[PDB]
Amino acid sequence: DKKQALLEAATQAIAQSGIAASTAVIARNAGVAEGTLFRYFATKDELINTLYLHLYQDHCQSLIMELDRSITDAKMMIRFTWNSYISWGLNHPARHRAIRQLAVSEKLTKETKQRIEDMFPELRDILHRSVLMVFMSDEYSAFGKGLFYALAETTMDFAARDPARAGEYIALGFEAMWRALTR
Amino acid sequence: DKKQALLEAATQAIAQSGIAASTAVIARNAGVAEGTLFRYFATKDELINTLYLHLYQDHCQSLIMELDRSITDAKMMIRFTWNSYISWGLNHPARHRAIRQLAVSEKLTKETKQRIEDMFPELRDILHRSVLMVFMSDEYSAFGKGLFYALAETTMDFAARDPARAGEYIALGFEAMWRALTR
Numbered sequence: 001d002k003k004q005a006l007l008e009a010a011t012q013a014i015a016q017s018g019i020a021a022s023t024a025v026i027a028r029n030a031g032v033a034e035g036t037l038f039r040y041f042a043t044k045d046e047l048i049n050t051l052y053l054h055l056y057q058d059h060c061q062s063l064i065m066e067l068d069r070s071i072t073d074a075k076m077m078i079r080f081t082w083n084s085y086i087s088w089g090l091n092h093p094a095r096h097r098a099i100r101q102l103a104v105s106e107k108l109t110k111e112t113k114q115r116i117e118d119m120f121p122e123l124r125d126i127l128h129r130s131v132l133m134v135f136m137s138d139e140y141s142a143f144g145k146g147l148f149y150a151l152a153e154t155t156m157d158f159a160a161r162d163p164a165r166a167g168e169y170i171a172l173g174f175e176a177m178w179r180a181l182t183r
Numbered sequence: 184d185k186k187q188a189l190l191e192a193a194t195q196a197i198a199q200s201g202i203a204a205s206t207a208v209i210a211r212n213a214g215v216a217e218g219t220l221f222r223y224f225a226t227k228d229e230l231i232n233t234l235y236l237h238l239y240q241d242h243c244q245s246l247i248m249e250l251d252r253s254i255t256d257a258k259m260m261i262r263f264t265w266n267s268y269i270s271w272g273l274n275h276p277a278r279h280r281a282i283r284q285l286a287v288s289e290k291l292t293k294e295t296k297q298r299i300e301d302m303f304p305e306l307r308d309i310l311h312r313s314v315l316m317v318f319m320s321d322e323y324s325a326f327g328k329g330l331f332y333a334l335a336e337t338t339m340d341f342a343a344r345d346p347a348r349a350g351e352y353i354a355l356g357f358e359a360m361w362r363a364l365t366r
């Protein structure tokens with residue numbers, strides 16, 4: 001649909017030009033009038049919230065399928081989630097570049113945040129037992145996600161530039177992320 | 184001099200368009216012919232190395248002056264260095280955006296890396312006792328710097344967007360950086 005085209009154009013524009021990207025640019029790049037964009041997303045805020053759910057789901061749905069019926073401890077599940085996320089961002093640079101800006105956005109609604117939290121219950125539960133309490137507070141939750149994405153971004157940058165050592169940067173990134181964010 | 188203008192234009196271009204930025208763009212933005220740029224920096228590699236020393240020194244020289252004749256432990260000195268760095272990046276976004284790309288560049292020479300290491304001996308010594316050994320290895324030194332800059336960047340982004348909580352994001356960033364990078 002045009003909706004998927006819009007979502008893709010919004011991913012590219014936000015990855016490239018930041019979360020501030022124009023609805024005009026986004027509409028133009030999807031090959032539609034801006035008025036058409038507005039029929040699908042009345043507000044930039046709606047677009048941020050919908051795009052974030054769509055991109056989060058793009059990664060999360062494949063991860064849920066891979067992990068299903070495994071028995072993991074907290075750290076194992078979290079390492080799988082981290083390695084999966086780096087793979088996804090390597091495969092889909094713009095998706096990662098857009099999502100890490102969306103996830104820390106002031107414009108996310110409580111409903112959206114709750115949907116993201118509950119999309120993968122097994123992981124939510126593991127994170128609740130593992131994440132430093134400060135980074136599950138209303139005030140600092142987005143900052144803890146930001147730090148994850150920052151470390152993930154660095155990891156992807158080194159893995160892409162020096163693919164010979166990709167797994168080493170992913171493991172070292174994971175280890176630093178774990179220390180930085182867990183109890 | 185034109186050299187300072189070139190360094191400033193190279194800071195802006197690299198911050199904006201990445202370490203890949205054109206010598207033509209850089210020369211144009213400094214108001215000189217590209218041939219003139221080449222009289223000051225024969226190679227893009229020379230420009231990366233010189234710009235990185237210049238920007239590192241821009242922060243480090245003021246930090247050395249502030250810390251002089253203090254008695255600090257490792258962690259105190261490192262917290263001062265981190266808070267100083269966030270202040271600098273808030274005051275000088277392009278300087279931070281350029282430097283974090285320069286510092287992980289494959290084009291840095293051994294001489295440059297050694298000059299950066301030795302510019303502030305007291306801090307070098309403290310870091311040698313504090314930094315995880317992996318992040319002082321030849322192979323992963325740049326990756327450990329990258330992770331620092333990533334966490335610093337996130338911290339600056341939240342401190343700039345939500346200045347009411349700047350010190351809280353700086354302290355939480357510092358705490359995560361410390362866990363991620365130290366023994």
Ligand SMILES: COc1cc2c(cc1OC)[C@H]1Cc3ccc(OC)c(OC)c3CN1CC2
Pocket residue numbers: 055056059060063078081085099120123127130131135144145148149177178181182
């Ligand atoms: C787009 O796909 C994802 C992105 C993210 C996630 C999970 C995702 O897929 C399921 C998780 C994964 C994760 C790991 C470890 C954490 O702290 C120890 C953590 O809290 C800060 C977080 C919270 N989220 C960070 C961003």
Ligand SMILES: COc1cc2c(cc1OC)[C@H]1Cc3ccc(OC)c(OC)c3CN1CC2
Pocket residue numbers: 238239242243246261264268282303306310313314318327328331332360361364365
């Ligand atoms: C541009 O100015 C600076 C940038 C940086 C530095 C110091 C600087 O000014 C003196 C230091 C500060 C610092 C802290 C803690 C570290 O690990 C615990 C560390 O190793 C990774 C590093 C290494 N460098 C990161 C980048």
